[PDB]
Symmetry: D2
Subunit: 480 residues, 4 copies
């Protein structure tokens, strides 16, 4: 195999620059060097705005139970159907090469290359979020991100944002358990967090939540375990998940679905479209869908794991987004950031390409590798053999329930009630882990009012938790 | 054929946005709409900084005569060998959709997809150039480019540069004949302008110049003729050349080489490596090489004619650049601008991709469509099966003739002598044309000193042309 | 002034590259050369996807009549207030350096640097548009743009689209008069085309349309006149408007507003919010607002006219978009394309920069010249003196009138009615010019049933015009 | 202070998206939301290809001793002259948010904002490099970078490359002492590694090396110490250096220079221009130049530390690059990558901007914030007030010493000899640490031939090291 330039010219000497004499300066005419150095200079692209640290693998999804009752999604009609998937697991706040032992939700992303298009599942392990409207997401992230001067994450900064956005209480309850540091990607669950809509063949729509349950079980690290691991291996989760697949101990998860009829949405003490809210298995049963097996590592990380883009509003027919106000901003954000991060034709890259043929009138854009060449780039047109709309594929109408449009916060926020229930649903071990992690984190806040507000927010959720935090801190909340 | 999103989801309704009601505001969840518009939003890329305006087509090069004597270049070894080519012809100064009736050199670019890699011929119709050092190219372009306030080309600006850089005189002789406006791309010659080095299997090197000769002959347009054409068709040359191919009237050119022994370089009243100097056919004979035939229009202009990059420094084994100081900056410039204009991985696109297989240790970069998957991305390595250098392909050594490096103008400039020779080689018809065009261009110069300088420069070249310019302008030339 | 590199190093020799000898190859260590070339290599950015060709100038808006009864827009409160403006005028379909003699609507864009933010008016001269839903815009553009193979605009393609999308009929009536070729940018009107919403201090909203009247009158070119101009000057309108300002003949326009109560939207034979429909002066009267004077040319085309971004959705308090399905896509499109075309931080460039101060929690992005330095990059936050929201500026609620969202075409299409009205409002001159231009255009269509359809669409609008086109073409229309 | 959009419009509600009803879907017309999310989507830019993990601060350089004897560099003429500096320290191989406890050279970069332009010092702590020609850098970096499939650094890969490129031996001797892991940025030295050239007022040139000596002393961490620190703090060095400055304990370094007359270069058992070679203090004395004090943290990491670009070939008059083949490729590469990573106009950003004024003929390029507005954008020109060249600043000619140019490896490679002396110059504790670290590293190599090669490479430098490695490994080297 001959070494070549990008021009296919064979290289004779890959060790020496062309110089003006044996010990003289380098020549501008060294095309081979400059081509090599110039490409090297251009290897890097922007990391993900969040969830930059991650691990991806290939596998298959296998449907066990037909879902035709709830959705007319092609792949979900018949038990036994298998769909290729690519998955990516990730942390959130810190960058590429950041340790995998930090406290963070863990991203859980699955691209399904379906016969009717790509569907992206893009969730986290943790079943709720800090906030309920996309308007706040840059703020939340900016608050959690390293301090913009010091480049170091500072709890004084994020506890500020969080205390003043008290809907974050419930998420705080989850993230400061030991479930805030999974032991690895293969030992964690997945959650859609948002409701979506599934519509069946007759146009009945239900609200659905999605649920991944690992065959290896949920396994977490305590703070001291995380520190121990960090010192030895800053790539532990990636390492462990890569080795398991390479050794043939294939990571597997089961997919379950929760179904809530639209006519029942007022029936709870919470808005079911609020992303700060969970649907307890107790109140809404999990129904088995199928199982994902990841059985093949990437061939190349950059081209596969780094270059994939997912979007929760990338859905197949039979699937629609919910009105969830946090989800609604995501629909835009993901693809929007990918046009910048990966490129305008990012959907043409092997890792992003659908299994279904792409036939449309879109054209051009930088690096047009899979340019459709028909000169007929407009629709409607006169030609019968060019791509046409298939009316049966139109997304059905959905209901509107208000007489006004504008900036209108939902009515039943219930910022503390469900958070309290989540606390009381925990075992003693979980409640003690939560207290020690919260205390350790609040000891790092440098503004008293923020600490007071944090303890107060927790107190409203559960009085005894708030009392314990008060004692450990030691800040008396009694006057308030 | 089903119409689809870039995700492979069949589109039901390609005519209506999803709105909050039949006469309501558009929804951010309209993924189909946003994908479509966002891609549309990104269709465009930067135009070529020069030669933006152009036309491309595919064809074949047939070598008629073996070049073994002069070069070891594989495709040139045997009579009858055929190489696929892609050619682009161009104006220079104005942008995309610029009239093709403007006075400019015309670009003549040919990519040869060779058994030993790509070779780009990148020349103009005209046999010489305005300057002799790349250092001056941005200045020269900026002077000819539309005034940066008015956005209209102004003779007052570029005559300023050209008079103050007297080496331009020779090019001014050519450019202001009627050969400044070719009738069509098919009715023009091609010139390498610079000499290059060819090296044979034995290791002898010769200076060479390359030459394209139109089967349809050289045909030009007077000013008034160009004005007539321009009013009815601003894409006239692209239109003619497109139609010619489609009608089966394939444009052909014969290629010729001029050969100069490096030992004979100081035997002239000019420096043969000076880009402002021609190699007259009567001094160095044209030797036939073969013939190019353009026999297929692009399937798609954007992915072919817009997205192609050429570099005079993209050479196959057997070829090397000369030390011509204008050429030497071009070796860098072209591939550098393509990395910007087209993208880091521009050599991966089909129009740029070699016929010879590419095998190397380069990786990543934006849109890594053709990523090499082997994890061995470093050389030297322990693996016999990975790409290896092939020493017999090592570019040969070349003489150094000085004991200092630095910023050092050539001795024999001869800024006016050959410019004179060229004029006295013209027919009386061409000399009248030169005068009419010169006068009509010099009439637009608002600084009398620039006008005087032009006149002196032409005078030093040929005293009769000088006095004629003076008489017509009318500024007598007895003082200075 | 000493000539310097971008590093601030004074340059000794700007004429010669650094070479390995007087006649030797160029050195890679020539930083000065490489910096200069590499920057030249990067001068170009993408041109606008539409309206690439254009001219900009600075000026002033003077408000003459208070608009307080209709809007609480600060700058519109007091008769006498001046706002600085930047305006850009353009053709539509072809690229940079394309003739300004071509048949095209003309862009009319004005940035108002107001005390309460930038307001961008982004209209055309013609008062209607070809289509009424943004979903169709890429298709409409693609059909009108050069054929993706020949690189020449083809009536056979765009008629194909326009006939198949018969809502276009009204716009064809307009664009095929002589008004399709304005004599220049100063000699044309401007239209909002869409209605917008103005909201007052008491919270009443009205539908509004905006209207620019030239002090110079509306002046147009016939096909033959445009053809004669084109031969001589392809920059004719830019040239005219530039010179006019230097000469002190300041291009001026009066601004007029047409008002409509949301209560009266059903009292017409058309949907007021349909972009294919005009609001006739004699049905909704023009009310005078103020005058714009353009009194200063750009210092630099690139940094001003090239680099400016407008968006019709960039509105000041007191203004809101209507539900016009074409407008609603524009809200997204413009800013979207600018982030790609100009850059993520395009709003930080002087030409785009507001007069009002920018204070928020956004950060970073490529080329962050005006980066906000405060480490408090999140809101809410504990700091009294960091930026805070001002609730009285909250865009107020707007009625919703449907109980479903979805892909739902409007009721009163009236694709031909008002198109006929328009034709019958024309003088005999205009009707003659329309006939000539249409026939000349329809003679270039190569497909029978497209021509037939065009004549039928025009016939449905007006029987006599239908007959005359039928007569001239010449197909009898007795059957169908 | 009012919260505003990038348009300067006051925001009233920064908490709620505009939605089609209180519990309905989000509106495309929420300009405020989309501007916000869309800028957030674009915050990230590519990290540095190498040395992505870093820390920057401002300060001052004070010249203690005139250097006029050796250079005519303006800032170095007079004792007591003070120049502003920005410094950045960094690791090498891993990405942003990588631990600072990893084994790697440590980058030491200093930008001097001089009265005659910017000078960049761009060195490492360690005084030699792994390779001696730029041709090999991508390969070396690829071998050291995470395996492109596992995303984990693998000694089996980098030992492959290193053993097969035995010139690396000397650097291995350095990097595998505990100096492979400095305790922080303020407790490490700096080295130019390369010689450069200094030219005085008379045109005499000497070769110089540059040396930074920390007031705080050189302090390192053993492997176990590094492990302990890593578990607790992955930002330790950034943390420590930022706190020192913030507490008023300013990091200081003394700058020293070593001088070698060009007439003495043949006098050593090594080529003094080989970047794998050190110039021992006892062979060429260090001469005090001045001191750097870092006294001011950044206001903003992104705009300062992230967006700064340095290039060792960015030199002031009085300074020139040496013909060092490693240094030669760096002259091109730094500015090349920055054009991509930061932007074509990267030199216009506050952190990169010279102290000295920038006056030249370059124009345009993306985000032209500091566009020079003069319409005279070409040189030579007629105007005496426009930027002119200053011939006294012309870079002096330098010697050439060969009669050929081509790919020509230096003759006295001495790959093992100096490496031997470096080992023999070590203390016994340094020698034990070296052995422990090498053994720990070579136990992770999985190919016997590479371990044997490594051991043989060390043996050739020093027999007792070769034996100690052989015994500890346990690999028999006797048969060879
Ligand atoms: C009544 C309908 C329309 C009018 C009057 C109009 C007018 C204009 C004008 C005047 C410009 C040039 C602005 C400038 O000088 O910078 C422009 C550019 C543009 N238009 Fe529109 N247009 C219309 C419809 C649309 C639609 C439906 C879309 C797609 C949703 C669209 C997308 C664009 C884009 C992407 C640009 C490029 C802007 C830039 O690069 O900054 N236009 N249009
Ligand atoms: C002994 C030789 C070398 C030393 C001492 C060295 C040191 C450094 C340092 C300290 C930085 C970080 C600058 C900063 O803080 O921004 C850096 C970055 C970099 N280096 Fe070198 N390096 C060496 C060799 C090379 C070579 C041979 C090349 C290839 C031609 C190279 C290419 C690069 C590139 C492309 C960057 C990224 C710069 C940017 O994005 O701004 N280095 N190096």
């Amino acid at each position: 195999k001959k070494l070549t330039t990008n021009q296919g010219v064979p290289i004779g000497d890959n060790q020496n620059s062309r110089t003006a004499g044996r010990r003289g300066p380098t020549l501008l005419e060294d095309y081979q060097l400059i081509e090599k150095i110039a490409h090297f200079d251009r290897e890097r692209v922007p990391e993900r705005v969040v969830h930059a640290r991650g691990f991806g693998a290939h596998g298959v999804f296998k449907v066990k139970n037909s879902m035709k009752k709830y959705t007319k999604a092609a792949f979900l009609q018949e038990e036994g159907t298998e769909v290729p998937v690519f998955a990516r697991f990730s942390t959130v706040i810190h960058g590429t090469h950041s340790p995998e032992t930090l406290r963070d939700p863990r991203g859980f992303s699955v691209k399904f290359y379906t016969e009717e298009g790509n569907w992206d599942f893009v969730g986290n392990n943790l079943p709720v979020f800090f906030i309920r409207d996309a308007m706040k997401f840059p703020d939340m992230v900016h608050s959690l991100k390293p301090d913009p001067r010091t480049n170091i994450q500072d709890p004084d900064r994020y506890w500020d944002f969080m205390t003043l956005r008290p809907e974050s209480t419930n998420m705080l309850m989850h993230i400061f358990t030991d479930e805030g540091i999974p032991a690895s990607y293969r030992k964690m669950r997945g959650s859609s967090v948002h409701s979506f809509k599934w519509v069946n063949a007759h146009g009945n729509t239900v609200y659905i939540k999605l649920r991944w349950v690992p065959k290896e079980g949920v396994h977490n690290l305590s703070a001291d375990e995380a520190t121990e691991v960090q010192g030895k291996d800053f790539n532990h989760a990636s390492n462990d998940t890569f080795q398991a697949i390479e050794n043939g101990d294939f990571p597997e998860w089961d997919l379950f679905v929760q179904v809530l009829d639209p006519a029942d949405v007022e029936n709870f003490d919470f808005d079911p479209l609020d992303a700060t809210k969970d649907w307890f298995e107790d109140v809404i049963p999990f129904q088995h869908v199928g199982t994902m097996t990841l059985n093949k590592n990437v061939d190349n990380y950059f081209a596969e794991t780094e270059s994939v883009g997912f979007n929760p509003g990338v859905l197949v027919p039979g699937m629609l987004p919910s009105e969830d106000k946090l989800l609604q901003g995501r629909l835009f954000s993901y693809s929007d950031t990918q046009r910048h991060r990966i490129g305008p034709n990012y959907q043409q890259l092997p890792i992003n390409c659908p299994f279904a043929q792409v036939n449309n009138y879109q054209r051009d854009g930088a690096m047009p590798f899979k340019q459709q060449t028909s000169s007929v780039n407009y629709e409607p047109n006169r030609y019968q053999d060019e791509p046409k709309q298939t009316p049966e594929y139109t997304e059905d109408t959905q209901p509107l329930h208000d007489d006004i449009h504008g900036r209108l916060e939902i009515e039943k926020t219930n910022n503390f009630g469900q958070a309290g229930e989540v606390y009381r649903r925990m075992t003693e071990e979980e409640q003690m882990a939560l207290l020690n992690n919260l205390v350790n984190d609040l000891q790092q806040v440098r503004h008293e009012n923020t600490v007071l507000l944090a303890i107060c927010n927790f107190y409203r959720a559960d009085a005894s938790l708030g009392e314990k935090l008060s004692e450990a801190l030691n800040v008396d909340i009694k006057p308030f």
